[PDB]
RNA sequence: GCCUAGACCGAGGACUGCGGUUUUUACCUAGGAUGUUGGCAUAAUGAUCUUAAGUCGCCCGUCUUGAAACACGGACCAAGGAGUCUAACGUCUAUGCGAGUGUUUGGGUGUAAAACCCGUACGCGUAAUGAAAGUGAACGAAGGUGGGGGCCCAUUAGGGUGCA
RNA sequence: AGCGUGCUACUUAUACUUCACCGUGAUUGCUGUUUUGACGCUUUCACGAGUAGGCAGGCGUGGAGGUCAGUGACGAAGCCUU
């Protein structure tokens, strides 16, 4: 008992010091999250103002093309040709209802085009990204799937990339940042459930023709609401 | 031993995102926007109604 | 031990590890070295080249005793010096008194010249020596004395 | 490209600034504003079927 | 079974439980449960009896009286989940229910003289207030049952 | 179902313990299981793997190899480490004074180390005078000089040894080994 | 749970695993044998066929080997065999061998009661 | 932002962590269920057997691309019943010794087919190549270069030494 | 309750999500507290179809060396038995 009370007092002192040091880090991440919120709102209002001004000035504001996409594999693992199978493996989509974040370039666009008959993908909103990371967000730590239940896991794995919080990670994903590759690869592929409300009557046809595969764009957010 | 959803557990939410407190305190989710009662589409954008 | 063989583990499985189509038959392919020129050519050509044909001349009534000539190299030659006196000989050897090494009496026929000798005169008695073995022995101040 | 990268790197070292040499795949284009002076939108419709033989 | 001996490293000590963080929080009663409300008992000996709700005890139970003269249902506790809370109400501001608690119903046939006296004292005020509403005493003295064609998902109580 | 990108339930393919049931070899593994787990010294982690190796994977190190390894520049007073048997070499002309730690020594090898002023210690004696393997030098014997390796990867124009019981002019030298008898491979 | 406390004992399968067609033919005993036939409906796991042994039915390692009273049962032959259960009387129970005589069995029961060892078969 | 209906689950087992509230070296919903009440212990509870009902379930073994097959064996039961031993070998592994190794053909010895002991030869290895007569393995630290675990000097980096 | 087409809700696979348990592979840590099990204990994650066939870990049998100074005519073995 004596040893336990001695080590408890030592632990209490060390925890006092640790908490005092961590308070500053939590202030830092608070400021970063507030700044991220400010720039999100400012960018949204700026885009709205630009659209209104172009409407007023007999012009047309063309939105910037989306730089990020969320891809969900809605097809099983049977009867897949070798090339789309390899493409789905390289996207880390090796099961049904697996989701991944992709930064849009020519290379990744031609990749997603190869997997198009087997996936549903689209442009995720900020709230959808946040909900995904909060409920089903896992990290790859020593080749293990670890829940993101504390900011220390994110700091210990992405502090060399200036990611100290779950909000730093969400910001880095949403506004596609200079370290998007490392941040998205640290995230284990999201394992979603089936939709509450079901799919359309027949999944495996393009969204344009009344099916589920292909690009649904902003309705991926509704789909994620069904599945997350 | 048991993953807790920050969207259900408020304490875990504050553990992960301390700014949620300010978000809750300031009512950022229902923030008003100050703007004018203007309508700038009265002119050539009425090309949408007919052409 | 029979309890360690895989025959005990194949019990209960129909074919006993021999296959259901291929099965285990008497002698598919023939017995012994059958078919070495026709359907086992692919085996003998790959793994035993030179098997078929004649090379060289015969030797009726060959007595291997005629060709007895065990070899000893130079790097193993000083092991024939007495173990209790090796270190003293390596020091006090000179042109006036060098150790005698009777290689034939130790069971060797020819002295070969692999390795390097101590820079020490020796008297080597051999039935046969190579050109370089004797050149190395003379270089350390030694000599080869032919015996029979 | 090796020579061009070497020239850009030394010129950035000379100017004391930085330059990025990794190639990039083509990215989605940014926002833009379309002027309609002389380019008022023309309305099209699908055309009826005709035989030309 | 077999001859497998226990080992020296097979300890028999029982570890202490971890410190549980299930700190209890107060019971949240239904909004319809207000003292003076007429209740319908669904289970127990007095199932189907219309009774008067008097006090919320600290055991999460409800203090209830018939009154005993009208019904035969005495002062006792019931569980809130075995009760239908109707819309009929009796003014119980004139009824003293201070002395009633969990220890009153402690387990010690016979019946205490104290309990009989308390029954009369509570029932005097209860009957005095019940007489004001016509047919309320008759309503309380009648048992409840579901008639043919009664749909509890459509009925108001 | 899962689309597996790698084989499932695959053993590491490396020995995690000696195959030997020698209790005294176990004690050395016991000692270096603790050292490799707790010292961060790469020397102790290499030794633990080497104690698992099979007989053909720990070839004998001749006392000539130690002499040649000690003749590197600045390695004359290093501690020679051999995870295996150290054998004698009667082709050496001289041996230096050296400290050598090995699993086993032959009678000739031990006689040669102590005659020249050296020490022949075991690997447990090594762990006290060098618990981090400071100033050591691991020596491994030749693995590909084995006779069994002569026949590995045999084929046409491969230059390997035929699998044969007798040697001579009548044994696998005519057709396929000679252009006068058809072809040569 | 008069024994050392344990989790609730779960037996994943409580029926006997009976060999296929041990009911059709007397020569086929109920002792489980895996069907190896090419066309076998049981080996191919058709719907409606018998359950088969697999590692999924394995017992919880915390409740494995425990009798309904929560004890592990140890086979006892002579009175000296109870000595190994001295420090395990609340987690291990003794079962008296069938071939112990009526004399020695009374001595084992008497000493086990003295030592506190529980006896699973107290009447026979 | 707020209220509200239901279902399933409760793994873990002194403390340790991150937060929150701080009224506090204290408290909390924050590293996994507790509190309270009733009943039962001649038993509520659980299992098995038999049987009924619901639903599904074609005869196994075999050869076959394909078997429940209008393909073959099998009426039933008990007992027996099928990859063995040997000579010589390939790979891998363990062990003893190690440039040597193998006592067991034989000799000594014996408490007598055992155990214990002994040594010359011989086999294999220590040299290859050529059909053969024959000849027969260091220019050099037994070589150079690029890597190369480990070790040494350092001080990110870097250098030295570098077995397999 | 047919045909073409649109819409709302609903039904259910050994599939998907969360959770329990079994096994396999990896993985965290464990000797001045290693403490009579280190061929042992422990943290965590992922995975589990299979003929022919390979390997591993086990169950059972006749007989043998050693041990339990084991059971047994006060009943061994065998046999029958919700
Ligand atoms: Mg402690
Ligand atoms: Mg990706
Ligand atoms: Mg639904
Ligand atoms: Mg629908
Ligand atoms: Mg459908
Ligand atoms: Mg066996
Ligand atoms: Mg098998
Ligand atoms: Mg099989
Ligand atoms: Mg059969
Ligand atoms: Mg086979
Ligand atoms: Mg067959
Ligand atoms: Mg065959
Ligand atoms: Mg021939
Ligand atoms: Mg699976
Ligand atoms: Mg995987
Ligand atoms: Mg080499
Ligand atoms: Mg050879
Ligand atoms: Mg021949
Ligand atoms: Mg020719
Ligand atoms: Mg069951
Ligand atoms: Mg059972
Ligand atoms: Mg059941
Ligand atoms: Mg069978
Ligand atoms: Mg088939
Ligand atoms: Mg009997
Ligand atoms: Mg529990
Ligand atoms: Mg923190
Ligand atoms: Mg039925
Ligand atoms: Mg049917
Ligand atoms: Mg047939
Ligand atoms: Mg056939
Ligand atoms: Mg046919
Ligand atoms: Mg059939
Ligand atoms: Mg037919
Ligand atoms: Mg046929
Ligand atoms: Mg036939
Ligand atoms: Mg017959
Ligand atoms: Mg017939
Ligand atoms: Mg019949
Ligand atoms: Mg063999
Ligand atoms: Mg010989
Ligand atoms: Mg010899
Ligand atoms: Mg020359
Ligand atoms: Mg080099
Ligand atoms: Mg219709
Ligand atoms: Mg499952
Ligand atoms: Mg399931
Ligand atoms: Mg210690
Ligand atoms: Mg399997
Ligand atoms: Mg299998
Ligand atoms: Mg097993
Ligand atoms: Mg046996
Ligand atoms: Mg027999
Ligand atoms: Mg015996
Ligand atoms: Mg006896
Ligand atoms: Mg009978």
XYZ file of C-alpha atoms in Angstrom, chain F residues 92-182:
91
model
C 48.725 -21.291 -40.522
C 52.326 -20.266 -39.970
C 51.528 -18.172 -36.871
C 48.600 -17.022 -34.734
C 48.271 -13.770 -32.752
C 47.085 -13.110 -29.219
C 43.317 -12.646 -29.400
C 40.067 -12.891 -27.449
C 37.499 -15.166 -29.123
C 33.971 -16.024 -27.953
C 32.389 -19.087 -29.580
C 29.820 -21.801 -28.948
C 32.462 -24.535 -29.258
C 36.204 -24.937 -29.732
C 38.019 -27.935 -31.150
C 41.004 -29.356 -29.295
C 43.422 -27.932 -31.860
C 41.750 -24.517 -31.936
C 41.798 -24.064 -28.153
C 45.391 -25.304 -28.040
C 46.312 -22.616 -30.587
C 44.519 -19.668 -28.962
C 46.029 -20.286 -25.526
C 49.491 -21.139 -26.873
C 49.705 -17.717 -28.530
C 48.527 -15.820 -25.462
C 44.823 -15.553 -26.267
C 41.541 -16.404 -24.567
C 38.841 -18.896 -25.579
C 35.637 -17.858 -23.808
C 31.974 -18.742 -24.224
C 29.168 -16.397 -25.254
C 27.950 -15.957 -21.668
C 31.417 -14.781 -20.633
C 31.179 -12.344 -23.561
C 27.917 -10.815 -22.302
C 29.526 -9.551 -19.076
C 32.687 -7.996 -20.528
C 30.710 -6.652 -23.531
C 26.966 -6.460 -22.790
C 26.520 -4.164 -25.811
C 29.068 -5.990 -27.964
C 31.483 -3.076 -27.794
C 34.665 -3.432 -29.862
C 33.535 -6.811 -31.235
C 33.777 -8.390 -34.676
C 31.404 -11.140 -35.832
C 32.961 -13.802 -38.087
C 30.868 -16.121 -40.262
C 32.059 -19.177 -42.148
C 31.659 -19.859 -45.857
C 28.172 -21.129 -46.652
C 28.550 -21.748 -50.409
C 31.698 -23.906 -50.165
C 29.601 -26.917 -49.115
C 29.604 -29.981 -51.371
C 25.795 -30.104 -51.455
C 25.811 -26.611 -52.978
C 27.788 -28.027 -55.926
C 24.599 -29.602 -57.296
C 22.243 -26.675 -56.628
C 20.735 -25.094 -59.728
C 21.967 -27.813 -62.077
C 21.058 -27.548 -65.742
C 22.392 -27.143 -69.282
C 25.284 -24.656 -69.481
C 24.949 -24.098 -65.734
C 28.402 -25.382 -64.787
C 27.198 -27.349 -61.764
C 28.101 -30.849 -60.545
C 26.148 -33.871 -61.790
C 24.414 -35.912 -59.141
C 26.532 -39.050 -59.443
C 27.827 -41.854 -57.219
C 31.006 -42.864 -59.102
C 33.475 -40.708 -61.050
C 35.358 -41.692 -64.187
C 35.414 -41.816 -67.970
C 32.471 -44.236 -68.207
C 30.201 -42.146 -65.964
C 28.294 -39.328 -67.682
C 30.970 -38.000 -70.063
C 29.973 -38.987 -73.587
C 26.817 -37.579 -75.201
C 25.853 -34.100 -74.039
C 29.303 -33.540 -72.511
C 31.315 -33.657 -75.735
C 30.997 -32.309 -79.282
C 32.518 -35.479 -80.753
C 29.510 -37.360 -79.329
C 26.739 -35.148 -80.659
